[PDB]
């Protein structure tokens, strides 16, 4: 040996392959789109945002992030979000402002579900 | 199970007889009841007690024969009659005796 | 673990070893051990595999021939309690004690017992080697009770 210092020799670690699964039942996706998008908001402030800013206001799950909101609005309503802005409301629910890419029309999206 | 006659200890009571724990090995062997069979047929044993005086030993021997005389034993199976078993007539006349069947 | 073991042999060196424990440290030679271990290798006990077919074979001898006919197989004897028993009955003819038994008290008194009972005894080097003969990991003692009539001279 040249070094005076004895280090820990490195050995093999074998990976896990258990003889029975600790979980048989699969995972349901409990935050699916209907959990993510609960219901659109119909406050007069929101109805302004539809015309003036091409925007849609939803009440969303408290555990949904901006990315999943973008995905779920494409599966449901088959549209595109240019930008999603969120805030957790003073009473505990999360509100998402969805801006549609300028292809789609927010008013026509508003009509196809019924808000205006 | 059957208890033998013993004298009490201590001057104040040595003139009084009472039930003891169990028969000694000599009392069991003199009456011809094997050591490891007695608890199985209703007779307690005491590997600790001693026989220092002949009369006490004689008294407890007679109890074992008196008990053996009025003891009846059912077979271990239905029809096989091995040693120590009894006649069917005996086993129908048999009831659960209650109280002190051998008073002291 | 390395540090303590090296000092353990060094501290052993420095201290005065009393005679009973220094009666080891005088082992049988290499020349004689190769001679002795040649004999022991002849009398290895029956291997695990070497043991199940004969019991399979003696099934037929019992099931049809209705006789057991296998004759006395002759092999070395081992196990400390067994060898001590053979020694005190004087059925032992050669005792083979490993120098490196730990705890040593298991064998310290064997030299005295074999000397008092007048059986030849040797101290070979390596308990792991004795265990190899009998198909164990270590053995710590061996003894040959009886040799075949072909090896009286060599024995």
């Amino acid at each position: 040996r040249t070094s005076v210092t004895f280090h820990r020799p490195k050995t093999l670690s074998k990976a896990r392959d258990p003889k029975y699964p600790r979980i048989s039942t699969p995972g349901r996706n409990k935050l699916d789109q209907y959990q993510i998008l609960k219901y659109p908001l119909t406050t007069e402030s929101a109805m302004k945002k539809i015309e003036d800013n091409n925007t849609l206001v939803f009440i969303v799950d408290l555990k949904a992030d901006k990315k999943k909101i973008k995905a779920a609005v494409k599966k449901m309503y088959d549209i595109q979000a240019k930008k999603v802005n969120t805030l957790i409301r003073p009473d505990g629910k999360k509100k998402a402002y969805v801006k549609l890419t300028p292809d789609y029309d927010a008013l026509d999206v508003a009509n196809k579900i019924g808000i205006i | 199970p059957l208890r033998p006659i013993v004298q009490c200890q201590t001057r104040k009571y040595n003139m009084k007889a009472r039930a003891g724990r169990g028969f000694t090995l000599e009392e069991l062997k003199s009456a011809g009841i094997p050591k490891k069979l007695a608890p199985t047929i209703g007779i307690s044993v005491d590997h600790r007690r001693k026989n220092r005086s002949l009369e006490g030993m004689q008294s407890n021997i007679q109890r074992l024969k008196t008990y053996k005389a009025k003891l009846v034993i059912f077979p271990r199976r239905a029809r096989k009659v091995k040693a120590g078993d009894s006649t069917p007539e005996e086993l129908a006349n048999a009831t659960q005796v209650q109280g002190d069947y051998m008073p002291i | 673990v390395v540090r303590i073991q090296r000092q353990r042999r060094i501290l052993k060196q420095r201290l005065k070893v009393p005679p009973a424990l220094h009666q080891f440290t005088r082992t049988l030679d290499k020349n004689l051990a190769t001679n002795l271990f040649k004999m022991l290798l002849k009398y290895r006990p029956e291997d695990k595999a070497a043991k199940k077919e004969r019991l399979l074979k003696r099934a037929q001898a019992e099931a049809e021939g209705k006789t057991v006919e296998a004759k006395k197989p002759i092999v070395v004897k081992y196990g400390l309690n067994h060898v001590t028993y053979l020694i005190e009955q004087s059925k032992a003819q050669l005792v083979v004690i490993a120098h490196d038994v730990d705890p040593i008290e298991l064998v310290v008194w064997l030299p005295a017992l074999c000397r008092k009972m007048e059986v030849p005894y040797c101290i070979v080097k390596g308990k792991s080697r004795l265990g190899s003969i009998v198909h164990k990991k270590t053995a710590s003692v061996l003894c040959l009770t009886t040799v075949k009539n072909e090896d009286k001279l060599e024995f």
């Binding site: 957790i88 003073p90 009473d91 505990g92 | - | -």
Partner: protein, 50 residues
């Protein structure tokens, strides 16, 4: 403060949902004894202590 944690914001939200007078129809149920909300809180009179 304006700088708060999510955990404190969560508890403050629940405290607001609980400052409401009881529904009127509760007063009509069979074998009812609730008169008013006996736990109403006012920010200037009783502090939350959290």
């Amino acid at each position: 403060p304006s700088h708060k944690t999510f955990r404190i914001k969560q508890k403050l939200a629940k405290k607001q949902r609980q400052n409401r007078p009881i529904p009127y129809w509760i007063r009509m149920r069979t074998d009812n004894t609730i008169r008013y909300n006996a736990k109403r809180r006012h920010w200037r009179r009783t502090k939350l202590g959290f």
